Amino acid sequence: AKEDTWAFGPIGSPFPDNPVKALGQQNMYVALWYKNGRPMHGRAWNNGGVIECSFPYNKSELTGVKDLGGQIQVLQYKGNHLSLGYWYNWIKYSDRFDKMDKGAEMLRCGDSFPILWSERPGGALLGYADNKTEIARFSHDGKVDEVSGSALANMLIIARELKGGPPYCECEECKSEPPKPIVRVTLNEWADFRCGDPWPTVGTPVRALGRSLDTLPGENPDQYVALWYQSGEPVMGRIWNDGGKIAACFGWGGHEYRQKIGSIQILYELPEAIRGFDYDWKPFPEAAQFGAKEWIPVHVDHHKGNISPAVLIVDGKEILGKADIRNERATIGYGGTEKVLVGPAVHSCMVLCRKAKPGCTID
Ligand SMILES: [Zn+2]
Numbered sequence: 375a376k377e378d379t380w381a382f383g384p385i386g387s388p389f390p391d392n393p394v395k396a397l398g399q400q401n402m403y404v405a406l407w408y409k410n411g412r413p414m415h416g417r418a419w420n421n422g423g424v425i426e427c428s429f430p431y432n433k434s435e436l437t438g439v440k441d442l443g444g445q446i447q448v449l450q451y452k453g454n455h456l457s458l459g460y461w462y463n464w465i466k467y468s469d470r471f472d473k474m475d476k477g478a479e480m481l482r483c484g485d486s487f488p489i490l491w492s493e494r495p496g497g498a499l500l501g502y503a504d505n506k507t508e509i510a511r512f513s514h515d516g517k518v519d520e521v522s523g524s525a526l527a528n529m530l531i532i533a534r535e536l537k538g539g540p541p542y543c544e545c546e547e548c549k550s551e552p553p554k555p556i557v558r559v560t561l562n563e564w565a566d567f568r569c570g571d572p573w574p575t576v577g578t579p580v581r582a583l584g585r586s587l588d589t590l591p592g593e594n595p596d597q598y599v600a601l602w603y604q605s606g607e608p609v610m611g612r613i614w615n616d617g618g619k620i621a622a623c624f625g626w627g628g629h630e631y632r633q634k635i636g637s638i639q640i641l642y643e644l645p646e647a648i649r650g651f652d653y654d655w656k657p658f659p660e661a662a663q664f665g666a667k668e669w670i671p672v673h674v675d676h677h678k679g680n681i682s683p684a685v686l687i688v689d690g691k692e693i694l695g696k697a698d699i700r701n702e703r704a705t706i707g708y709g710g711t712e713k714v715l716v717g718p719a720v721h722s723c724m725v726l727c728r729k730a731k732p733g734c735t736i737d
Pocket of ligand 1: 454538543545548
């Protein structure tokens with residue numbers, strides 16, 4: 375087995391290839407920093423296409439290049455278990471002994487290991503636990519939490535699994551193995567890429583309306599769903615394949631963003647056999663009936679409004695951008711600005727929704 379890769383993470387620049395997310399979290403990645411040779415884990419996130427991060431130290435939250443220096447590291451998982459000898463599995467902290475006895479190795483750097491407080495009211499936080507003191511620390515809001523004892527039991531830590539592949543692996547060895555019962559996937563699959571990277575080969579991006587658009591002047595007819603962040607706010611927008619390279623456009627804060635976009639997340643449609651839901655684009659009034667829990671808009675949640683992918687009709691043309699269904703607003707980046715629709719004007723939007731398969735439950 376290769377050792378873990380902690381990839382180079384210059385603060386204020388885009389993420390490295392294949393960063394490892396905190397399980398289940400939209401914009402939270404496993405991160406590592408050192409002070410005087412001593413490792414500690416923390417968290418990184420995307421803001422405006424680049425790395426921001428937070429670590430607990432000296433009972434303070436350190437976030438700056440001035441607190442931290444110019445670079446941290448972000449856990450990377452590039453390749454698969456055939457070339458690496460391991461895959462990462464998130465387990466309950468209380469299960470670590472059983473897991474180690476079955477042959478798993480716990481991810482660690484010195485005495486520090488990542489720990490995810492998944493069920494924390496108001497949102498998960500990723501922090502670190504100290505092997506010697508068994509205290510977990512989490513940095514946020516300029517403060518540090520410290521938690522120990524039984525409150526750790528259901529928090530999640532990373533195990534390296536040294537045998538086989540992960541549950542949905544499609545490498546030739548896993549493909550040839552005798553099938554095992556799976557839970558179908560109920561989380562939307564989002565892949566990390568930087569704008570200007572080569573077009574994705576590892577999955578199937580989700581195309582506006584499932585077809586070429588009759589779109590606006592200067593836009594590519596084949597537009598696909600992507601997520602970016604501005605000031606901690608989720609922004610859905612569009613990517614297209616520009617000469618083999620990812621190109622993107624987002625609208626937010628009254629502006630259009632078409633360059634220096636950096637790190638984005640691309641939505642993938644999983645293989646039908648492993649997914650617990652199907653996608654389709656639905657008229658806004660149908661999409662708004664999410665309460666029935668039949669077709670539910672794809673959404674990333676934020677306190678200012680939850681944001682969904684949406685094709686708008688502008689000047690009689692179709693164009694991929696974003697909508698807040700509950701607040702009846704929808705926008706695109708276009709023409710050097712953010713074009714905004716509200717109220718009844720959003721009812722013509724087509725919203726990306728998903729519907730749970732029988733036996734499955736989604737939100
Ligand atoms: Zn495999």
